[PDB]
Amino acid sequence: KIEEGKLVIWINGDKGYNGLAEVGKKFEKDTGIKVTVEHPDKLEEKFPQVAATGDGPDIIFWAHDRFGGYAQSGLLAEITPDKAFQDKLYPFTWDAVRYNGKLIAYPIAVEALSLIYNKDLLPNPPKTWEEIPALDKELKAKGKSALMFNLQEPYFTWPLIAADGGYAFKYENGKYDIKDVGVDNAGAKAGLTFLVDLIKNKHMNADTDYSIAEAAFNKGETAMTINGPWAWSNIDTSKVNYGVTVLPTFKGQPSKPFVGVLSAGINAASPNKELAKEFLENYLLTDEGLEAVNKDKPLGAVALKSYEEELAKDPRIAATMENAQKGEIMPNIPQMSAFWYAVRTAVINAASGRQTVDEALKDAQTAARAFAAASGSPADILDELTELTELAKSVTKNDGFEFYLNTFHDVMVGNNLFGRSALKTASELITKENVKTSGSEVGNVYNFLIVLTALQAKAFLTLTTCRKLLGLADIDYTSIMNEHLNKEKEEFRVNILPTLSNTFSNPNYAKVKGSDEDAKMIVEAKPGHALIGFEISNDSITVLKVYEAKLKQNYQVDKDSLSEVIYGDMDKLLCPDQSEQIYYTNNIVFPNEYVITKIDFTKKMKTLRYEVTANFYDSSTGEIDLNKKKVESSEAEYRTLSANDDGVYMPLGVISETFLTPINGFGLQADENSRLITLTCKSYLRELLLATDLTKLIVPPSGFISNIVENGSIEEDNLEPWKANNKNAYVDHTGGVNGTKALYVGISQFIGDKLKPKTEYVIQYTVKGKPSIHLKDENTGYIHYEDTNNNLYQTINKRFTTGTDLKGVYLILKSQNGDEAWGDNFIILEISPSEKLLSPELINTNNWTSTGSTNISGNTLTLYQGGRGILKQNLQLDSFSTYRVYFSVSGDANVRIRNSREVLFEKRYMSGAKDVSEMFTTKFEKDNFYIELSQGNNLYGGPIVHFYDVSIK
């Protein structure tokens, strides 16, 4: 229940509250806004008590170290000072008031411990710490001590300890790493050891409190003391002429005192956030405002650059600022509470002799880190429970995770089921639910065994760590786990693996319309490589991924040589449009030492054949012979698929074993009723598994390897070829797509030499907003692909070709007519070349043979009336191929294409037949085939017959 139109300020009583009230009176007399400055006791503890319920002051004045804990609970409002105002204050003071990249308070003053000395007895103060023990003896004879400061609090003894490299929490990238504590390093040891040695040599007293130290110095009983600007007011009254200088250096390095920044935060529950902003930015953080506070009680150094230059004329303020820059900014995280207790107890124990410096700091680093799981049993048990919950989510994407847990338990207690082992009954369930899944039975069941043993390994690992956490006696569960493991391997190898099938097919289908034109597609591996995996996916474009790689011993894939080649126009074959398509179907299977390296698809005259090449593979050397080949094809058995204007259901999904392995079988099946086209292959996984039981298997990648765009997905480290253009291009907006990073707008990346001239590519990107994506040559201006102004994340997928202009091609993401745009997961893919079906002419003029009266005049073939003419030309045909005879005929003629035994085509035209186009096919017989032009009858010698434009391709 806060009021509006009024400002209420809470500032500590040690501050100049009367001066801040005078600035408030100036604020009210210029704006009408009442400013009430209150100085409550326990102000650091009372603010979170009242602010948690929504009440409290509008502005809170305290050191920045406690404002992180306030921002933790969302008690401070995010201030929004413009860039012009931010430059009026020192940049290091803005970092003290920054929490998780958010500004939470305005910095007012800067304070830090400094060396205070008595000029009457010490004209020049000692520059280094090591001089103090020597100089102490020379003044002890005169009845005085050298140095006396507060030893009970660690805030005072820390600059000496942190001199040689001590630190509370490692500061990196604006974040305090709670797992890195620097109290037990060599630097902190040397620091505290010197402090203890000063006490052992009776140069300092381990019981000196704040009161004892201040009294000794202000009455000239000691030469030096360490204190802050707050202590100046009390020595001013004593008139003991004092100077404030830099702190002594230790081991050549300067003392590092903690730096406190007096900050003014705005209550996140205050309804006067605009009123508070005006008071702080325009009235308090000014030369007149800070001076008014300074006149009441000194502020020391100030964050305002303007007024600090005026204050630096005082050597005391210049010294506090000098010491502050040498020291380290106080961490504002709440874990400092453990740090303070750790160092406070360590210095006390080390001074009193209860512990040595090595012992005090070792447990101090344990206590400082205590808010994070200590390395060992506590840290591991948390990592093991998290890794186990990930394994749970791995097998709950609809069996279930509890199925694995039940099966795992049944193996441990030796609970056999249905007479066979529990692994067998679990395996039979795998082959009864994974029937429409990528991979074969060998792959799917072996994958089940991998997860089962991975859970088995974690269960035994969790047990071991749980016993260490409980202080229980060590037990080595390695042999009892290995015993269970070998029993599981033996069961799968002898009882489960042989009865499993090694055939895998496509898991899904997609209703798709292709083309009716002839087409060729040759999937071939590089010399020495083998085809190892396939994936068909159709999102507006049909893309075929083929995986090849070198082979190692026993059908293992060479991870170093794994390549991914992209083939386009997969839908253009396997699918007709408005017409029929004949699919020749023969399951090809090679012997047990040959690996498929080449699949040759041939679409000719609405017929689809394939010819598979398999080279010989050696199980002792990784060599695949380039000359010991075997070639089989879809020979003669054909299925016919009617026109059906609504498509043909192309095969979709991952045609691969669950682990990338070579294949020795391939076949296409087409159902004449359901129009389902099914690709099926046989895998080498069982031969691999039977030969090696030593996860060196490779899983078929989900995304596209060989992606031309580097860093395409922007979810990696700042390593990126993307270049921002020196504008508001926003390197890495974290919180983009799905939660991950995304490009905000612009950004450009050079691809350039990775492109090929006059080659077809596929671009894909998930963008939102109004993006202007261009793939243009920044030298000639040639645009290879453009995505101009388009409406509101969607994954656009288009296919394009480049031309002759590549030595400057960039992928540029910018916006249209000044708007914003987000783009993620850019993909550019090369489409390996396909080749045009070469159907040559098989009829030549000089290859005709005559019987009877005939005549050959150009394109006209004439069978004379009286002469019983028969023309015959031999045809050079292949074993399993589709051809087409074309001609026009006028007389009563009979065309027939025949061999000594087989006939491919025969028809009698007892009338004019213009533009005849008949297809014929060969079945394993290719030699001694000929076309025979003759008359339909031979009565009276036959009628006159003219053949026009005879052609066979």
Numbering used by the authors: 21 to 418, 421 to 716, 721 to 771, 776 to 822, 825 to 985
Publication excerpt:
Here, we report the crystal structure of the C-terminal fragment of Vip3A toxin (Vip3Aa11200–789). Through the addition of an N-terminal MBP (Maltose Bind Protein) tag, we were able to isolate crystals with improved diffraction. The final structure of Vip3Aa11200–end was refined to a 3.2 Å resolution with R and Rfree values of 0.1980 and 0.2389, respectively. The crystal belongs to the P21 space group and four MBP-Vip3Aa11 molecules were found in one asymmetric unit. Then the protoxin can be divided into five domains, starting from N-terminus: domain I, 1–198; domain II, 199–327; domain III, 328–518; domain IV, 537–667; and domain V, 679–789 in Vip3Aa11. The overall structure of the Vip3Aa11200–end resembles a lobster, wherein domains II and III form the body, and domains IV and V are the claws. However, domains III/IV and IV/V are connected by long and flexible loops, which indicates that the relative locations and orientations of these two domains could change under different biological circumstances. Domain II of Vip3A has an all α-helix fold, including two conserved hydrophobic α-helices. Several studies have reported that domain I of 3d-Cry toxin is involved in its membrane insertion and pore formation processes through its conserved hydrophobic α-helices. This therefore suggests that domain II of Vip3A may also take part in these processes through its conserved hydrophobic α-helices. In our work, the C-terminal fragment of Vip3Aa alone has shown no toxicity through cytotoxicity assays and insect bioassays, and it forms a dimer in the crystal structure, which is consistent with the fact that the C-terminal fragment of Vip3B2160 will form a dimer instead of a tetramer without the N-terminal 21-kDa segment.
